[PDB]
Amino acid sequence: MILFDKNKRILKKYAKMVSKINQIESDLRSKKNSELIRLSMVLKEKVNSFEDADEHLFEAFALVREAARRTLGMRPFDVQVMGGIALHEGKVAEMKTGEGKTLAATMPIYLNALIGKGVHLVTVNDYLARRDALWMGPVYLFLGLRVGVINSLGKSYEVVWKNPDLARKAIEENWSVWPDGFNGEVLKEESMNKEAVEAFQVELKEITRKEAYLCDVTYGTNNEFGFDYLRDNLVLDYNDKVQRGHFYAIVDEADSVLIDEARTPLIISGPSKESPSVYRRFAQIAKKFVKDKDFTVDEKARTIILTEEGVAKAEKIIGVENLYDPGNVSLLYHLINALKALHLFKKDVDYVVMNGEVIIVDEFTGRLLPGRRYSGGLHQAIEAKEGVPIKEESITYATITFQNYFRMYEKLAGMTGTAKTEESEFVQVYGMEVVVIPTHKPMIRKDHDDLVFRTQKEKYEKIVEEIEKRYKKGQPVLVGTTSIEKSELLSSMLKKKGIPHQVLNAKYHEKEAEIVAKAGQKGMVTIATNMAGRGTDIKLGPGVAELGGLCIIGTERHESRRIDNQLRGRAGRQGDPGESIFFLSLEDDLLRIFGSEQIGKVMNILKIEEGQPIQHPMLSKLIENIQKKVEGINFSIRKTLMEMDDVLDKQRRAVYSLRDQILLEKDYDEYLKDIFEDVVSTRVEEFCSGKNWDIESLKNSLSFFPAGLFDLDEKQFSSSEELHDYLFNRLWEEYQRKKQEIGEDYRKVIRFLMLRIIDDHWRRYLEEVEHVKEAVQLRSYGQKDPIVEFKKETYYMFDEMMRRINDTIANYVLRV
């Protein structure tokens, strides 16, 4: 039962659900205003629980679409209608242009939210969180709900301002001048008496984490959503409504929801005891590698070391010790650090905003992420390479953005995609499918091949003249570059040849705004990074599309087939034409280090002597295979931490689920003591017989406290576990309440203690979990290869972990 037999069987399935629901919208155009409001109340109490109220989805969705028609157009296509359908099911309708991802989403988002639980709506970035947030905000105040979006450090979500605005649409609800002249998806521009009043619904006020989530819909970015989830850790107070239950979610541009391989870790408190050292130390460090040349072999992954001149340098500076390894790698660490710093990551990708002097990282498909680092050595390394040096190096928690998160609870339905690349994925983890649908007018846009050029980005030069020829013909163009550097030079190029343009390459945020509508306004020229050229309700002004419609020049082909296409797809919304073209150099990057060994012979032996335009013998063909190839590597590494972290999902669970129960409950007294003793007592009877010197000695190390309790008191043979247990138990319980003398406030003491102490231990031993990741880098040879050694060590450390807790957490409940 697996073929088109499935894709098509899906067709009729929905072609049916749609026919019925289509009739629903038909007999409802009765200008249902106040009555519709009543319908918002009707459905409201029609579910109140995830009982999967199917029938509702029919009359409700009907109300949805129409609800839009009243507030703002854009709602007559089907892959959006059918979208929400399959969406509510958990797969992926769509593929872009017209369709309705903005509106579509709103459809199922409505039914599900009704539960009163709060639904998730993943989106790649902040700017976009705000996007959908308002683009559909209307229908929400219409269906009386509370939007809810979270971002970087602050969060907001709302409808029109104060009281007048409400008193503006309240009656205009009863009024609502619009239902007339319909019968056609030709949503033109008019009815200003409606827009000028309702369209101004887009407004936002400041709120906080709590009301945010518990509100209705929750608009946010995975980066954030993840961090929120984890924010739920060192929460001495559970009153912190930090995220109200995690479960359902629809992914806006899920073609990325997956590519978020690198885990989601909130890292922050870094108590550097060697901060001043790092300062001076790292200064010397960085300069050290400066002392050495190119030869240091740095490629195919961010790991590096150098041969001859390397060992040479090692000895050449602070360390006449040849044999450096002897538990003396701490220093070599310093070298590798700077080494990798000054090279692995161009300081120009870990930029310094306008004299903010802060070395921030805008890397990893993002767009400027304030104060933070992906590691405990890079931040301080490059810092040593620039100027102002920090003193942080912290960890805390981690998690897989998807399976560990989403599969932790409920479902998902992505938007766009199609390639087989995603189905196997949407299986091995998420557990969804695909519903490829071409809305009115399919792939109406034009595309052009991967025109290649040799020896250096000198092709990017040829693409310049290209942007020109377009400009003259009055064509609105745009380019999708790779990084910030190349992006800049790009502009400089247009300037050196005199060409107006705007650059939204994470320069400034405000830029992203203006450019929103200022990107493609007849002949307009715009250059931006893929981080702004991935899914966007872009449009176009006047005649604009007069010829071609839109033009897109790609600076190269990303690390993924989809992404490549994405940057391109940014030319086609609502269902209009356009033009795309890719300029690639056999000395670009994608193949400068990936597949270079292949392209080498296949080229220098095939042909070398020529001009510039070429792609007749295996060029676009070969590179293609390389692309998928690279993606493959990602797929591979995707495995390593995915599988591992899975075993971590278990451990982590017990972790703060325990920190939860301790935060909630009260007198775990008899428990903590008991388990503390049984653990410490069996200790006095596990690796040390309860004889005399045997125990007194080993147990001494087991009982190293400034306190005094039968320490130097020997001569005892009455140790049948019962006797020994009561002895220390009373020293505790008694001296406990006796020490409880402090006051009722003593209750919140274990609070600070338990959590912090527990949190502390865990996160610490998590540092060790990374070293264990090295042991799994060992399994490769000898024993099997299915995460074995890791699982067996993950628990070894897990048991060690806990017992450790009880010890420290214990003595801490005293010295005060």
Binding site: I2, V427, V429, K784, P786
Partner: protein, 65 residues
């Protein structure tokens, strides 16, 4: 002429099966190692499976008895 016609058919059964593995490798690889849960509850191609085992117990009664 059941054994002759169904014979050519027995070979057909071999096709749908040799392929079930070829394509059935989104978590299988010879001596690979993937106890990959979160996926797997009686393949939609298990109809082929039942068609197979049933096919040979079928050649049992038809061949001799």
């Amino acid at each position: 002429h059941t054994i002759i016609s169904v014979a050519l058919i027995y070979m057909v059964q071999v096709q749908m099966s040799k392929f079930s593995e070829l394509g059935g490798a989104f978590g299988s690889g010879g001596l690979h190692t993937v106890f990959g849960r979160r996926k797997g509850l009686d393949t939609g191609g298990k109809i082929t499976l039942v068609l197979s085992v049933l096919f040979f117990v079928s050649c049992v009664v038809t061949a001799f008895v």
